[PDB]
Amino acid sequence: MQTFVHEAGRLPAHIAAELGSYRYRVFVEQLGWQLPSEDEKMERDQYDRDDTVYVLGRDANGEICGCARLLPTTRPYLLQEVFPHLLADEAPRSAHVWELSRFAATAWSVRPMLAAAVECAARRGARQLIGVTFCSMERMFRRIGVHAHRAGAPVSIDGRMVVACWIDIDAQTLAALDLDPALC
Ligand SMILES: CSC[C@H]1O[C@@H](n2cnc3c(N)ncnc32)[C@H](O)[C@@H]1O
Ligand SMILES: CCCCCCCC(=O)NC1=CC(=O)CCC1
């Protein structure tokens, strides 16, 4: 796949609709996070703002096959406000930490999506990423080789095993993702 990072403020209308539809299909239809909706397929919450950073992966036909959301911890974020109890410690508010959420890929698919997210966050000054991740996804991160470690004990939410996860943007993570080591 090919990755596209959107960090220019409010998403253009067509991208917002296309991403919203892809998210609806993954998080609502696939994972069943909400009941079926009516009208346009759209999945968005209070964390989708003009300042939100997005990563979209597109296949050979230019269709979305992956997504990711990046938020600075110095501003409101999901783990902080919604799932703070998943953390061993209090939720961080630092320029060096960004939250990765709504991460999905439609194996060697996850890698490019993660690389784009890390690269972007690093260029914005982040030294670590944090976020609630399915343990199955946590295992892929481990296999990919990034330096991921737990920020809390695992818990099964509505039948889905997840855990607050850290990803250190260090030499190991950068190398595993084929990114510029200088980003360290
Ligand atoms: C991220 S772990 C998956 C759980 O997070 C919930 N979730 C995702 N985003 C939000 C949100 N903005 N507010 C409340 N719950 C959320 C989903 O409905 C699912 O049950
Ligand atoms: C610091 C790690 C942050 C990663 C957060 C993962 C985000 C997320 O929404 N998880 C998902 C993983 C899947 O397996 C399918 C779609 C949902």
PDB file of C-alpha atoms and ligand atoms in Angstrom:
ATOM      1  CA  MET A   1       0.000   0.000   0.000  1.00  0.00           C
ATOM      2  CA  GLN A   2       0.877   3.693  -0.207  1.00  0.00           C
ATOM      3  CA  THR A   3       0.445   5.988   2.803  1.00  0.00           C
ATOM      4  CA  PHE A   4      -0.957   9.524   2.945  1.00  0.00           C
ATOM      5  CA  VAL A   5      -0.576  11.756   5.995  1.00  0.00           C
ATOM      6  CA  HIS A   6      -3.058  14.615   6.367  1.00  0.00           C
ATOM      7  CA  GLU A   7      -1.925  17.279   8.855  1.00  0.00           C
ATOM      8  CA  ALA A   8      -3.188  20.529   7.305  1.00  0.00           C
ATOM      9  CA  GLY A   9      -6.105  21.290   9.607  1.00  0.00           C
ATOM     10  CA  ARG A  10      -9.695  20.460   8.683  1.00  0.00           C
ATOM     11  CA  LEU A  11      -9.794  17.547   6.217  1.00  0.00           C
ATOM     12  CA  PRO A  12     -11.173  18.306   2.780  1.00  0.00           C
ATOM     13  CA  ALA A  13     -14.832  17.239   2.562  1.00  0.00           C
ATOM     14  CA  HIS A  14     -14.275  14.280   0.233  1.00  0.00           C
ATOM     15  CA  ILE A  15     -11.465  12.850   2.376  1.00  0.00           C
ATOM     16  CA  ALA A  16     -13.536  13.235   5.541  1.00  0.00           C
ATOM     17  CA  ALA A  17     -16.385  11.301   3.917  1.00  0.00           C
ATOM     18  CA  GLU A  18     -14.121   8.597   2.493  1.00  0.00           C
ATOM     19  CA  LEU A  19     -12.234   8.109   5.770  1.00  0.00           C
ATOM     20  CA  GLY A  20     -15.447   8.224   7.763  1.00  0.00           C
ATOM     21  CA  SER A  21     -16.887   5.448   5.613  1.00  0.00           C
ATOM     22  CA  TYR A  22     -13.784   3.300   5.944  1.00  0.00           C
ATOM     23  CA  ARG A  23     -13.830   3.763   9.704  1.00  0.00           C
ATOM     24  CA  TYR A  24     -17.525   2.885   9.836  1.00  0.00           C
ATOM     25  CA  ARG A  25     -16.903  -0.368   7.986  1.00  0.00           C
ATOM     26  CA  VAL A  26     -13.994  -1.367  10.227  1.00  0.00           C
ATOM     27  CA  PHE A  27     -14.975  -0.195  13.706  1.00  0.00           C
ATOM     28  CA  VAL A  28     -18.736  -0.521  13.439  1.00  0.00           C
ATOM     29  CA  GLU A  29     -19.360  -3.324  10.933  1.00  0.00           C
ATOM     30  CA  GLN A  30     -16.243  -5.411  11.460  1.00  0.00           C
ATOM     31  CA  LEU A  31     -15.588  -4.907  15.159  1.00  0.00           C
ATOM     32  CA  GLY A  32     -19.163  -4.016  16.043  1.00  0.00           C
ATOM     33  CA  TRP A  33     -18.404  -1.050  18.312  1.00  0.00           C
ATOM     34  CA  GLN A  34     -21.845   0.451  17.632  1.00  0.00           C
ATOM     35  CA  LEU A  35     -25.270  -0.615  16.344  1.00  0.00           C
ATOM     36  CA  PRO A  36     -25.940  -0.328  12.597  1.00  0.00           C
ATOM     37  CA  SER A  37     -26.570   3.252  11.485  1.00  0.00           C
ATOM     38  CA  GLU A  38     -28.759   4.767   8.777  1.00  0.00           C
ATOM     39  CA  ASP A  39     -27.945   7.024   5.827  1.00  0.00           C
ATOM     40  CA  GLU A  40     -24.261   7.800   5.209  1.00  0.00           C
ATOM     41  CA  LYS A  41     -21.686   5.446   6.703  1.00  0.00           C
ATOM     42  CA  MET A  42     -19.784   7.577   9.202  1.00  0.00           C
ATOM     43  CA  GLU A  43     -17.781   6.750  12.304  1.00  0.00           C
ATOM     44  CA  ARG A  44     -16.383   9.730  14.212  1.00  0.00           C
ATOM     45  CA  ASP A  45     -16.136  10.907  17.823  1.00  0.00           C
ATOM     46  CA  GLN A  46     -15.127  13.990  19.836  1.00  0.00           C
ATOM     47  CA  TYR A  47     -11.466  13.363  19.016  1.00  0.00           C
ATOM     48  CA  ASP A  48     -11.897  14.083  15.312  1.00  0.00           C
ATOM     49  CA  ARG A  49     -11.044  17.799  15.219  1.00  0.00           C
ATOM     50  CA  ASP A  50      -9.505  20.303  12.819  1.00  0.00           C
ATOM     51  CA  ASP A  51      -6.140  19.725  14.511  1.00  0.00           C
ATOM     52  CA  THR A  52      -6.343  15.919  14.410  1.00  0.00           C
ATOM     53  CA  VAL A  53      -3.672  14.229  12.287  1.00  0.00           C
ATOM     54  CA  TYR A  54      -4.661  11.334  10.018  1.00  0.00           C
ATOM     55  CA  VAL A  55      -2.864   8.601   8.126  1.00  0.00           C
ATOM     56  CA  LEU A  56      -4.643   6.835   5.256  1.00  0.00           C
ATOM     57  CA  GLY A  57      -3.347   3.829   3.363  1.00  0.00           C
ATOM     58  CA  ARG A  58      -4.561   3.298  -0.214  1.00  0.00           C
ATOM     59  CA  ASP A  59      -4.371   0.188  -2.410  1.00  0.00           C
ATOM     60  CA  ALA A  60      -3.458  -0.166  -6.082  1.00  0.00           C
ATOM     61  CA  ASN A  61      -6.912   1.192  -6.941  1.00  0.00           C
ATOM     62  CA  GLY A  62      -6.555   4.251  -4.733  1.00  0.00           C
ATOM     63  CA  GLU A  63      -9.102   2.881  -2.255  1.00  0.00           C
ATOM     64  CA  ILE A  64      -8.576   3.230   1.486  1.00  0.00           C
ATOM     65  CA  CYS A  65      -7.174   0.064   3.025  1.00  0.00           C
ATOM     66  CA  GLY A  66      -5.838   1.492   6.269  1.00  0.00           C
ATOM     67  CA  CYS A  67      -6.162   4.356   8.735  1.00  0.00           C
ATOM     68  CA  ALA A  68      -4.713   5.904  11.874  1.00  0.00           C
ATOM     69  CA  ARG A  69      -5.383   8.899  14.090  1.00  0.00           C
ATOM     70  CA  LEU A  70      -2.706  10.948  15.851  1.00  0.00           C
ATOM     71  CA  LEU A  71      -3.347  13.378  18.711  1.00  0.00           C
ATOM     72  CA  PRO A  72      -0.963  15.338  20.946  1.00  0.00           C
ATOM     73  CA  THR A  73      -1.310  14.460  24.630  1.00  0.00           C
ATOM     74  CA  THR A  74      -1.184  18.156  25.531  1.00  0.00           C
ATOM     75  CA  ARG A  75      -4.757  18.276  24.225  1.00  0.00           C
ATOM     76  CA  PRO A  76      -7.802  16.097  25.002  1.00  0.00           C
ATOM     77  CA  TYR A  77      -7.421  12.442  23.984  1.00  0.00           C
ATOM     78  CA  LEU A  78      -9.219   9.063  24.163  1.00  0.00           C
ATOM     79  CA  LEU A  79      -7.148   7.070  26.674  1.00  0.00           C
ATOM     80  CA  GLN A  80      -6.952  10.133  28.919  1.00  0.00           C
ATOM     81  CA  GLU A  81     -10.646  11.011  29.077  1.00  0.00           C
ATOM     82  CA  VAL A  82     -12.433   7.747  28.283  1.00  0.00           C
ATOM     83  CA  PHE A  83     -10.157   4.922  29.471  1.00  0.00           C
ATOM     84  CA  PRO A  84      -7.860   6.431  32.133  1.00  0.00           C
ATOM     85  CA  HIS A  85      -8.372   3.396  34.381  1.00  0.00           C
ATOM     86  CA  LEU A  86      -6.457   1.246  31.899  1.00  0.00           C
ATOM     87  CA  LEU A  87      -3.280   3.043  32.922  1.00  0.00           C
ATOM     88  CA  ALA A  88      -0.833   2.018  35.609  1.00  0.00           C
ATOM     89  CA  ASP A  89      -0.088   5.713  36.085  1.00  0.00           C
ATOM     90  CA  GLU A  90      -1.823   9.019  35.350  1.00  0.00           C
ATOM     91  CA  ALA A  91      -2.312   9.915  31.667  1.00  0.00           C
ATOM     92  CA  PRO A  92       0.610  11.929  30.261  1.00  0.00           C
ATOM     93  CA  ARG A  93       0.365  15.503  28.990  1.00  0.00           C
ATOM     94  CA  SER A  94       3.646  16.027  27.188  1.00  0.00           C
ATOM     95  CA  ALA A  95       4.919  17.467  23.937  1.00  0.00           C
ATOM     96  CA  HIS A  96       6.994  14.283  23.700  1.00  0.00           C
ATOM     97  CA  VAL A  97       3.972  11.964  23.717  1.00  0.00           C
ATOM     98  CA  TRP A  98       1.255  11.589  21.066  1.00  0.00           C
ATOM     99  CA  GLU A  99      -1.708   9.206  21.109  1.00  0.00           C
ATOM    100  CA  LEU A 100      -2.274   6.701  18.322  1.00  0.00           C
ATOM    101  CA  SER A 101      -5.909   5.633  17.900  1.00  0.00           C
ATOM    102  CA  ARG A 102      -8.353   4.294  15.295  1.00  0.00           C
ATOM    103  CA  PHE A 103      -5.517   2.226  13.847  1.00  0.00           C
ATOM    104  CA  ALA A 104      -6.461  -0.382  11.251  1.00  0.00           C
ATOM    105  CA  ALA A 105      -5.163  -2.066   8.100  1.00  0.00           C
ATOM    106  CA  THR A 106      -7.091  -4.043   5.463  1.00  0.00           C
ATOM    107  CA  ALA A 107       0.649  -8.325   8.483  1.00  0.00           C
ATOM    108  CA  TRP A 108       2.924  -6.514   6.057  1.00  0.00           C
ATOM    109  CA  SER A 109      -0.014  -4.096   5.897  1.00  0.00           C
ATOM    110  CA  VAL A 110       0.256  -2.920   9.471  1.00  0.00           C
ATOM    111  CA  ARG A 111       3.927  -2.059   9.041  1.00  0.00           C
ATOM    112  CA  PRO A 112       3.593   0.729   6.437  1.00  0.00           C
ATOM    113  CA  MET A 113       0.684   2.268   8.346  1.00  0.00           C
ATOM    114  CA  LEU A 114       2.717   2.269  11.554  1.00  0.00           C
ATOM    115  CA  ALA A 115       5.815   3.638   9.813  1.00  0.00           C
ATOM    116  CA  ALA A 116       3.859   6.620   8.479  1.00  0.00           C
ATOM    117  CA  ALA A 117       2.340   7.357  11.885  1.00  0.00           C
ATOM    118  CA  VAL A 118       5.675   7.113  13.693  1.00  0.00           C
ATOM    119  CA  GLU A 119       7.474   9.240  11.098  1.00  0.00           C
ATOM    120  CA  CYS A 120       4.818  11.946  11.315  1.00  0.00           C
ATOM    121  CA  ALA A 121       4.672  11.980  15.124  1.00  0.00           C
ATOM    122  CA  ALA A 122       8.458  12.083  15.364  1.00  0.00           C
ATOM    123  CA  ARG A 123       8.690  15.043  12.979  1.00  0.00           C
ATOM    124  CA  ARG A 124       6.218  16.784  15.282  1.00  0.00           C
ATOM    125  CA  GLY A 125       8.521  16.262  18.251  1.00  0.00           C
ATOM    126  CA  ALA A 126       7.083  13.056  19.704  1.00  0.00           C
ATOM    127  CA  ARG A 127       9.472  10.648  21.431  1.00  0.00           C
ATOM    128  CA  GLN A 128       6.749   8.124  22.289  1.00  0.00           C
ATOM    129  CA  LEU A 129       3.309   7.010  21.161  1.00  0.00           C
ATOM    130  CA  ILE A 130       0.645   5.748  23.553  1.00  0.00           C
ATOM    131  CA  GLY A 131      -2.765   4.201  23.003  1.00  0.00           C
ATOM    132  CA  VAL A 132      -5.211   1.407  23.685  1.00  0.00           C
ATOM    133  CA  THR A 133      -4.404  -1.474  21.383  1.00  0.00           C
ATOM    134  CA  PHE A 134      -5.946  -4.890  20.844  1.00  0.00           C
ATOM    135  CA  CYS A 135      -3.475  -7.447  22.185  1.00  0.00           C
ATOM    136  CA  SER A 136      -3.547  -9.118  18.769  1.00  0.00           C
ATOM    137  CA  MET A 137      -2.282  -5.838  17.299  1.00  0.00           C
ATOM    138  CA  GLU A 138       0.257  -5.603  20.129  1.00  0.00           C
ATOM    139  CA  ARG A 139       1.604  -8.957  18.994  1.00  0.00           C
ATOM    140  CA  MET A 140       2.024  -7.711  15.422  1.00  0.00           C
ATOM    141  CA  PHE A 141       3.933  -4.678  16.699  1.00  0.00           C
ATOM    142  CA  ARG A 142       6.243  -7.068  18.543  1.00  0.00           C
ATOM    143  CA  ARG A 143       6.703  -9.162  15.406  1.00  0.00           C
ATOM    144  CA  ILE A 144       7.383  -6.048  13.313  1.00  0.00           C
ATOM    145  CA  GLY A 145      10.183  -5.220  15.735  1.00  0.00           C
ATOM    146  CA  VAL A 146       9.222  -1.826  17.137  1.00  0.00           C
ATOM    147  CA  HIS A 147       9.933  -1.104  20.786  1.00  0.00           C
ATOM    148  CA  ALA A 148       6.495  -1.536  22.270  1.00  0.00           C
ATOM    149  CA  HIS A 149       5.814  -1.974  25.985  1.00  0.00           C
ATOM    150  CA  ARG A 150       2.751  -1.936  28.214  1.00  0.00           C
ATOM    151  CA  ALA A 151       1.428   1.166  29.975  1.00  0.00           C
ATOM    152  CA  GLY A 152      -1.074  -0.922  31.935  1.00  0.00           C
ATOM    153  CA  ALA A 153      -2.366  -4.438  32.600  1.00  0.00           C
ATOM    154  CA  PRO A 154      -4.422  -6.128  29.852  1.00  0.00           C
ATOM    155  CA  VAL A 155      -8.207  -6.191  30.126  1.00  0.00           C
ATOM    156  CA  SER A 156     -11.011  -7.624  28.012  1.00  0.00           C
ATOM    157  CA  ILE A 157     -13.535  -4.939  27.059  1.00  0.00           C
ATOM    158  CA  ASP A 158     -16.866  -6.251  25.781  1.00  0.00           C
ATOM    159  CA  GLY A 159     -15.075  -9.471  24.943  1.00  0.00           C
ATOM    160  CA  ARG A 160     -12.019  -7.899  23.261  1.00  0.00           C
ATOM    161  CA  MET A 161      -8.612  -8.230  24.930  1.00  0.00           C
ATOM    162  CA  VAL A 162      -6.791  -4.889  24.858  1.00  0.00           C
ATOM    163  CA  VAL A 163      -3.999  -3.090  26.670  1.00  0.00           C
ATOM    164  CA  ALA A 164      -2.645   0.436  27.010  1.00  0.00           C
ATOM    165  CA  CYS A 165       0.513   0.352  24.898  1.00  0.00           C
ATOM    166  CA  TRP A 166       3.649   2.475  24.576  1.00  0.00           C
ATOM    167  CA  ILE A 167       5.822   2.615  21.459  1.00  0.00           C
ATOM    168  CA  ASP A 168       9.220   4.243  22.030  1.00  0.00           C
ATOM    169  CA  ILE A 169      10.381   6.230  19.026  1.00  0.00           C
ATOM    170  CA  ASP A 170      13.962   5.079  19.530  1.00  0.00           C
ATOM    171  CA  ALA A 171      16.686   3.545  17.351  1.00  0.00           C
ATOM    172  CA  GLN A 172      15.008   0.121  17.469  1.00  0.00           C
ATOM    173  CA  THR A 173      11.563   1.361  16.442  1.00  0.00           C
ATOM    174  CA  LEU A 174      12.949   3.598  13.703  1.00  0.00           C
ATOM    175  CA  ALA A 175      15.170   0.839  12.288  1.00  0.00           C
ATOM    176  CA  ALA A 176      12.344  -1.705  12.396  1.00  0.00           C
ATOM    177  CA  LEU A 177      10.206   0.698  10.348  1.00  0.00           C
ATOM    178  CA  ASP A 178      12.973   1.703   7.915  1.00  0.00           C
ATOM    179  CA  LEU A 179      12.830   5.331   8.997  1.00  0.00           C
ATOM    180  CA  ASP A 180      15.545   7.976   9.193  1.00  0.00           C
ATOM    181  CA  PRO A 181      17.631   7.176  12.296  1.00  0.00           C
ATOM    182  CA  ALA A 182      18.203  10.909  12.758  1.00  0.00           C
ATOM    183  CA  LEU A 183      14.535  11.129  13.727  1.00  0.00           C
ATOM    184  CA  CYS A 184      15.690   9.669  17.073  1.00  0.00           C
TER     185      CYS A 184
HETATM  186  C1  LIG B   1     -10.362   1.437  21.782  1.00  0.00           C
HETATM  187  S1  LIG B   1     -10.982   0.013  22.728  1.00  0.00           S
HETATM  188  C2  LIG B   1     -12.581  -0.276  21.911  1.00  0.00           C
HETATM  189  C3  LIG B   1     -13.745   0.362  22.673  1.00  0.00           C
HETATM  190  O1  LIG B   1     -13.522   1.799  22.697  1.00  0.00           O
HETATM  191  C4  LIG B   1     -14.832   2.406  22.539  1.00  0.00           C
HETATM  192  N1  LIG B   1     -14.650   3.799  22.081  1.00  0.00           N
HETATM  193  C5  LIG B   1     -13.924   4.234  20.999  1.00  0.00           C
HETATM  194  N2  LIG B   1     -13.975   5.526  20.887  1.00  0.00           N
HETATM  195  C6  LIG B   1     -14.740   6.020  21.896  1.00  0.00           C
HETATM  196  C7  LIG B   1     -15.160   7.330  22.305  1.00  0.00           C
HETATM  197  N3  LIG B   1     -14.762   8.441  21.585  1.00  0.00           N
HETATM  198  N4  LIG B   1     -15.959   7.456  23.415  1.00  0.00           N
HETATM  199  C8  LIG B   1     -16.365   6.374  24.141  1.00  0.00           C
HETATM  200  N5  LIG B   1     -15.971   5.122  23.760  1.00  0.00           N
HETATM  201  C9  LIG B   1     -15.185   4.901  22.680  1.00  0.00           C
HETATM  202  C10 LIG B   1     -15.493   1.516  21.471  1.00  0.00           C
HETATM  203  O2  LIG B   1     -16.905   1.691  21.318  1.00  0.00           O
HETATM  204  C11 LIG B   1     -15.049   0.078  21.915  1.00  0.00           C
HETATM  205  O3  LIG B   1     -16.015  -0.458  22.827  1.00  0.00           O
HETATM  206  C1  LIG B   2       0.794   3.042  20.935  1.00  0.00           C
HETATM  207  C2  LIG B   2      -0.085   2.052  20.165  1.00  0.00           C
HETATM  208  C3  LIG B   2      -1.435   2.679  19.770  1.00  0.00           C
HETATM  209  C4  LIG B   2      -2.221   1.772  18.798  1.00  0.00           C
HETATM  210  C5  LIG B   2      -3.738   1.928  19.000  1.00  0.00           C
HETATM  211  C6  LIG B   2      -4.564   0.941  18.130  1.00  0.00           C
HETATM  212  C7  LIG B   2      -5.833   1.656  17.597  1.00  0.00           C
HETATM  213  C8  LIG B   2      -7.112   0.844  17.293  1.00  0.00           C
HETATM  214  O1  LIG B   2      -8.131   1.503  17.112  1.00  0.00           O
HETATM  215  N1  LIG B   2      -7.049  -0.573  17.245  1.00  0.00           N
HETATM  216  C9  LIG B   2      -7.464  -1.593  16.288  1.00  0.00           C
HETATM  217  C10 LIG B   2      -6.701  -2.702  15.899  1.00  0.00           C
HETATM  218  C11 LIG B   2      -7.284  -3.836  15.066  1.00  0.00           C
HETATM  219  O2  LIG B   2      -6.882  -4.992  15.157  1.00  0.00           O
HETATM  220  C12 LIG B   2      -8.456  -3.505  14.090  1.00  0.00           C
HETATM  221  C13 LIG B   2      -9.012  -2.052  14.211  1.00  0.00           C
HETATM  222  C14 LIG B   2      -8.866  -1.443  15.662  1.00  0.00           C
END
